[PDB]
Amino acid sequence: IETVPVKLKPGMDGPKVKQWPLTEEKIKALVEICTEMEKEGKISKIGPENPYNTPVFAIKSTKWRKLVDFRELNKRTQDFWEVQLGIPHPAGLKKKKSVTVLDVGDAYFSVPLDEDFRKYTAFTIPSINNETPGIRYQYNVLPQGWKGSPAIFQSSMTKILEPFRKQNPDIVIYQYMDDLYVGSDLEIGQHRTKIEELRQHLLRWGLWMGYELHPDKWTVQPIVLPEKDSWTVNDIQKLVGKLNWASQIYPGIKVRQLCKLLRGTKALTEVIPLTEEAELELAENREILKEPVHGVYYDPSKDLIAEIQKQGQGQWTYQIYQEPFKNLKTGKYATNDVKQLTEAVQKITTESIVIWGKTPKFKLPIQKETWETWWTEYWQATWIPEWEFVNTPPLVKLWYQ
Amino acid sequence: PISPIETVPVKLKPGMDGPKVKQWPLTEEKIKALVEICTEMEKEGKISKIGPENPYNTPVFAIKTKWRKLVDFRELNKRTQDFWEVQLGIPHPAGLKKKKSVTVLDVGDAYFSVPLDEDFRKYTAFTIPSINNETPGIRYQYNVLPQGWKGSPAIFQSSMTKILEPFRKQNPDIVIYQYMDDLYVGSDLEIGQHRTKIEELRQHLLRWGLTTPDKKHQKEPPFLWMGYELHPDKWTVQPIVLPEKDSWTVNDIQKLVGKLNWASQIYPGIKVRQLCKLLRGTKALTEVIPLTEEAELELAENREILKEPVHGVYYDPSKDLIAEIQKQGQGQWTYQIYQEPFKNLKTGKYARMRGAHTNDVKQLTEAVQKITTESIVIWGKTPKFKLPIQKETWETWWTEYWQATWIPEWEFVNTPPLVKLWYQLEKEPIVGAETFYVDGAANRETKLGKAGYVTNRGRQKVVTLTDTTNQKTELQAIYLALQDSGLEVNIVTDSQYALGIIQAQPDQSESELVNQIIEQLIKKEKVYLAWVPAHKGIGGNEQVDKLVSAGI
Numbered sequence: 001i002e003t004v005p006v007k008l009k010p011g012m013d014g015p016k017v018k019q020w021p022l023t024e025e026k027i028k029a030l031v032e033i034c035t036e037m038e039k040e041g042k043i044s045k046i047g048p049e050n051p052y053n054t055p056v057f058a059i060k061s062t063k064w065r066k067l068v069d070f071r072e073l074n075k076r077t078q079d080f081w082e083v084q085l086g087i088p089h090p091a092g093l094k095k096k097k098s099v100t101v102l103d104v105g106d107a108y109f110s111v112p113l114d115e116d117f118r119k120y121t122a123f124t125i126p127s128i129n130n131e132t133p134g135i136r137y138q139y140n141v142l143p144q145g146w147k148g149s150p151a152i153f154q155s156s157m158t159k160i161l162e163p164f165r166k167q168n169p170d171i172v173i174y175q176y177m178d179d180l181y182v183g184s185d186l187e188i189g190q191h192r193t194k195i196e197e198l199r200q201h202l203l204r205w206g207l208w209m210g211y212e213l214h215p216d217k218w219t220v221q222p223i224v225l226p227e228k229d230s231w232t233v234n235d236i237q238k239l240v241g242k243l244n245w246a247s248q249i250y251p252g253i254k255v256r257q258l259c260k261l262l263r264g265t266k267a268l269t270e271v272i273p274l275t276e277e278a279e280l281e282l283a284e285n286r287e288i289l290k291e292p293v294h295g296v297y298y299d300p301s302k303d304l305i306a307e308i309q310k311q312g313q314g315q316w317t318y319q320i321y322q323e324p325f326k327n328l329k330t331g332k333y334a335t336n337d338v339k340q341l342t343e344a345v346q347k348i349t350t351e352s353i354v355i356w357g358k359t360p361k362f363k364l365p366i367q368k369e370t371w372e373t374w375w376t377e378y379w380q381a382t383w384i385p386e387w388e389f390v391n392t393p394p395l396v397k398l399w400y401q
Numbered sequence: 402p403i404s405p406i407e408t409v410p411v412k413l414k415p416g417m418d419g420p421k422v423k424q425w426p427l428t429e430e431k432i433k434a435l436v437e438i439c440t441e442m443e444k445e446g447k448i449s450k451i452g453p454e455n456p457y458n459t460p461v462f463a464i465k466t467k468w469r470k471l472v473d474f475r476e477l478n479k480r481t482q483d484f485w486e487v488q489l490g491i492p493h494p495a496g497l498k499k500k501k502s503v504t505v506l507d508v509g510d511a512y513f514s515v516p517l518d519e520d521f522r523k524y525t526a527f528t529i530p531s532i533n534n535e536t537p538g539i540r541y542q543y544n545v546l547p548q549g550w551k552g553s554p555a556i557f558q559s560s561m562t563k564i565l566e567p568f569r570k571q572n573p574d575i576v577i578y579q580y581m582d583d584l585y586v587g588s589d590l591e592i593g594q595h596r597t598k599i600e601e602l603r604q605h606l607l608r609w610g611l612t613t614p615d616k617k618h619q620k621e622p623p624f625l626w627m628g629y630e631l632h633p634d635k636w637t638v639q640p641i642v643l644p645e646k647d648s649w650t651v652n653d654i655q656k657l658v659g660k661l662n663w664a665s666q667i668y669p670g671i672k673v674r675q676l677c678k679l680l681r682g683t684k685a686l687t688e689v690i691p692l693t694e695e696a697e698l699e700l701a702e703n704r705e706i707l708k709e710p711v712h713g714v715y716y717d718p719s720k721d722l723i724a725e726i727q728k729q730g731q732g733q734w735t736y737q738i739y740q741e742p743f744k745n746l747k748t749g750k751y752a753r754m755r756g757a758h759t760n761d762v763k764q765l766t767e768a769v770q771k772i773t774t775e776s777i778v779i780w781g782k783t784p785k786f787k788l789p790i791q792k793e794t795w796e797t798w799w800t801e802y803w804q805a806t807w808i809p810e811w812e813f814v815n816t817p818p819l820v821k822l823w824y825q826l827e828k829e830p831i832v833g834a835e836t837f838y839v840d841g842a843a844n845r846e847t848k849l850g851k852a853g854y855v856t857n858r859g860r861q862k863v864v865t866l867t868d869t870t871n872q873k874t875e876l877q878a879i880y881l882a883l884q885d886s887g888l889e890v891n892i893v894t895d896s897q898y899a900l901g902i903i904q905a906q907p908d909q910s911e912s913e914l915v916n917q918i919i920e921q922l923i924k925k926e927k928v929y930l931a932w933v934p935a936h937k938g939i940g941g942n943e944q945v946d947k948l949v950s951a952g953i
């Protein structure tokens with residue numbers, strides 16, 4: 001087994017991302033891992049003639065796991081892992097009754113990395129109070145978290161899977177990052193039985209959410225128009241605002257029959273009766289918002305982006321789109337703000353993977369530093385989606401319940 | 402010496418060839434001094450003579466006591482690769498654990514005791530010119546890390562790291578701190594056994610080409626290092642002298658602020674808000690700035706705190722950190738970190754406006770976050786906080802606020818001023834409360850404002866601002882409704898801008914208008930605020946927009 005040559009391009013140099021401070025328990029957790037991995041020859045120490053860095057973290061059960069943040073490296077390797085050596089996305093995956101995710105990250109350790117490419121995998125284990133310069137490393141085998149790894153490894157992956165595919169051709173399998181997404185329409189017992197079978201196959205070679213995903217029972221969260229016994233002026237105003245902003249997404253939303261109600265200068269508290277055409281306009285808008293958005297389609301060349309709103313009482317709402325407010329999907333999520341926020345990210349990112357074969361750039365409603373301090377404390381994923389930090393317009397929070 | 406440690410390989414930048422910088426004709430005193438210096442250096446293995454085949458050159462200069470060789474490595478530095486950052490941070494005394502015995506060791510000629518990558522040495526070429534450049538100069542090249550070379554600091558660190566490794570393994574008790582030339586060693590074992598442990602280290606260092614101080618030359622505590630004083634069981638900043646001046650320049654105020662900021666690591670309650678405000682508005686370096694009364698007030702109070710020396714304690718891993726924060730002044734906060742009540746490990750301050758408008762609860766969270774990062778860096782863990790805010794107050798805020806926020810273990814501590822939400826917008830519209838439909842136009846070119854309103858009690862009013870953005874008028878209109886209204890009020894706007902601003906419950910702003918709106922909001926008994934789409938023809942919003950729009 002010899003190595004696939006890799007590259008960035010003539011343009012773009014490698015990643016020089018700073019290492020975010022880690023607590024003592026993790027720094028220690030990371031040295032145990034990095035000692036074992038150096039003895040096993042997977043990684044090896046490095047001198048400062050390597051100017052590149054990628055952040056590393058420790059996550060989880062009782063056992064720790066090393067997570068390496070290859071977000072910059074992926075961005076700078078896109079030609080390699082997407083166009084040159086890509087993995088196609090099956091549109092059937094989302095159609096399946098059940099999808100089970102399996103971690104096939106160990107696979108990548110038994111495959112050497114292009115010696116010319118190893119300098120771009122440098123990371124630092126930092127030292128408390130900057131006591132020591134802190135332990136520098138780089139990878140010799142394929143690293144987990146880098147998108148090139150499955151890109152390279154797919155030829156060997158096909159072999160491993162061939163018998164299983166042949167024997168179960170209505171089971172669809174997708175490889176993303178360190179994970180196999182394996183979906184079937186079998187009954188839950190038979191499905192699980194089939195997953196255990198796939199485990200054995202893998203075994204012979206080297207190897208939110210809630211157990212298994214169930215894609216076909218994923219549905220849009222409609223913009224909810226209340227039914228209400230009695231309607232006040234305020235309530236109509238609120239209803240008009242939703243419908244005025246929904247019309248910027250949904251072909252056919254109408255608000256005219258409701259303006260008819262709000263006359264000239266009424267008190268907000270004043271009740272007002274429910275007119276016929278307003279009654280119809282209301283119900284006809286309702287039916288529109290059940291359905292997906294007419295006119296909006298996934299363009300694989302554009303980035304997916306996700307916005308999430310904190311709805312209070314452990315409620316979160318979210319929307320995925322490529323062009324602002326033109327939603328490919330909207331949804332919902334339901335013990336502390338950051339913990340939940342991180343669960344929602346992971347969830348939404350999973351859906352994004354099952355549906356379009358990539359993760360969205362998140363617009364997270366939280367102060368940069370709070371998130372950077374705490375996201376890892378509850379993070380369970382093998383990947384890390386791209387995020388920026390945004391103040392939620394208080395109106396948008398309102399419009400999605 | 403020169404370490405036997407294998408050299409670190411060193412490339413130039415991918416597209417680049419090495420420097421061919423012309424040597425400037427130097428003077429005899431200098432030409433002489435260089436020869437003299439390069440001889441003694443050559444005979445110690447630091448440099449080596451070379452042929453005319455090597456095409457590379459770097460200027461050399463000599464300067465006075467004393468004579469020093471200065472190489473102008475600018476062009477080579479441009480051409481050599483980037484290296485990894487030497488360090489992410491400098492240690493903080495507060496993080497240093499207490500130990501019985503502690504020794505400082507500075508490495509002699511640290512750079513010149515480390516080899517350069519053979520394949521790179523060619524590029525370090527430089528020439529001592531002959532008198533009046535009449536004949537071929539003497540040509541040399543470094544075998545060791547040159548002074549002023551981009552890669553010396555990184556390569557040295559790497560070398561010293563590699564070298565220390567086995568000792569660290571063989572002696573996982575001994576704490577060794579790496580910083581530049583220096584090496585700071587500490588242990589709990591007794592003053593006999595330490596001095597041997599020091600010597601076998603010094604030996605290990607010597608075995609790898611690294612000279613080091615004899616026990617008659619090792620310094621004694623207190624260690625004056627990097628602005629601090631490190632005593633055997635306490636630490637502090639070095640002496641602070643706040644100058645006594647009639648007239649203060651911009652230069653004097655900058656140095657004062659700088660000293661106070663340094664002071665604030667262990668001296669509580671230090672404040673700089675008012676001294677800082679002076680510095681705004683690009684004045685001249687030496688230009689005198691009259692102190693305000695609040696500046697003068699501030700300086701006086703800083704002098705009180707500094708008058709008696711304050712010291713800090715060292716860290717004890719077997720205990721929790723406790724972080725306490727006090728509010729003091731709008732914008733300004735101050736904190737203390739200790740493990741045993743009021744024996745401070747360290748101290749600090751936080752001012753910082755995140756944006757134009759904020760409130761204390763938001764600022765308190767921001768300061769907790771800053772402190773949390775600080776602790777993780779210094780001690781590798783987060784402290785237990787003790788905050789001047791009620792759980793019940795905090796609870797109300799975070800749940801109703803749209804941002805996700807979170808802080809680790811904390812307890813209330815009654816240390817006034819106390820952080821409180823100064824007002825609370827209603828959640829539902831208010832019966833028996835006049836609904837003001839506010840609006841605000843502004844002609845783009847002429848800047849003439851027309852901020853006004855209409856109400857359900859019949860009232861209608863429009864004013865005229867001058868030189869206002871459309872933001873300003875829509876915001877002036879709300880202040881209008883808050884001025885002419887009673888102790889209850891529903892306000893209706895089509896400006897999301899103002900809405901968002903006010904729904905954040907600001908108690909403090911960089912805007913003037915907003916601080917006036919806050920004044921009102923605090924005084925009212927109940928305010929409810931709603932938003933509508935402009936120009937969609939809303940009962941009320943259309944009525945106001947009429948009288949508000951008149952004037953292009």
Ligand SMILES: Cc1cc(C#N)cc(Oc2ccc(Cc3n[nH]c4nnccc34)cc2Br)c1
Pocket residue numbers: 492497498499500501502503505576578580585586587622624625626631632633634715
């Ligand atoms: C950053 C840095 C600079 C310098 C210098 N010069 C020395 C250092 O080492 C240390 C300093 C203080 C302490 C506490 C300490 N415990 N016991 C002591 N006895 N004498 C002095 C300091 C200490 C430990 C180390 Br070990 C660290």
